[PDB]
Amino acid sequence: GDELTRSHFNALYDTLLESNLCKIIEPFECVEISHISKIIGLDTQQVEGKLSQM
Amino acid sequence: DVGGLDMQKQEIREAVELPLVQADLYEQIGIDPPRGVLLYGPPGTGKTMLVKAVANSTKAAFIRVNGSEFVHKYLGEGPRMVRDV
C-alpha cells in the first residue's frame, strides 16, 4: 500500500530470484535447466536469462 | 551508558577511531587529521566517560598514564620515562 517502499520490493524481485536460485544450485552443477524452471515457475527463456546474469 | 555527549562523542570518534581504521580517507579529502584530542570545561564532571567508551569499543592498545606519574625520584629517570611511552 505504500508507494515509497514499493520501489524496494520491485528491486528485491531480482534479488530474491537470485537468492532462490541458491536453493536450486545446492546440488552443485549438473542440473537440468527445464527442471529449474518447474521449481521456480518461470519460462525457460526467463530462467536462462537470469542464470547468465549471475 | 552515558548520554548527552553524542555531540562531543562524534568529534572524538572521527579524530581517534576513524583514522586508526581507514587512514586513506583523509588523504583523499586533503584534510590533515589532528595528532590528538584535548578536552576542556569544568573539572570533575566528564572527560573520563568518553575515553572509557573508546577503549571498550576499539579493543586495541591503550595507554593510561597519570600526568604527574612521569615525575620520578631520580633526575634523569623523568625524561627517560617520557620517551618510553
Binding site: - | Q28, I29, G30, I31
Partner: protein, 51 residues
C-alpha cells in the same frame, strides 16, 4: 602614539563579501572541492567573520 617609535600605523578593515571571496578559495585550495559550488555565495551568507 607620539612619533619616534611607530612610524607607520596601518588600519585593518574587517573582511567583507568581496574580501572573503578570494580568501575562501585559497584555504580550500589545499583540499578536495567541487566545481558546482559558488565562491561569492558561500561568503555572502557569512557576515562579520574573521580570517
Amino acid at each position: 602614539l607620539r612619533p619616534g617609535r611607530i612610524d607607520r600605523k596601518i588600519e585593518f578593515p574587517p573582511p567583507s563579501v568581496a574580501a572573503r571571496a578570494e580568501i575562501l578559495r585559497i584555504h580550500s585550495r589545499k583540499m578536495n572541492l567541487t566545481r558546482g559550488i559558488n565562491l561569492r555565495k558561500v561568503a555572502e551568507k557569512m557576515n562579520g567573520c574573521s580570517g
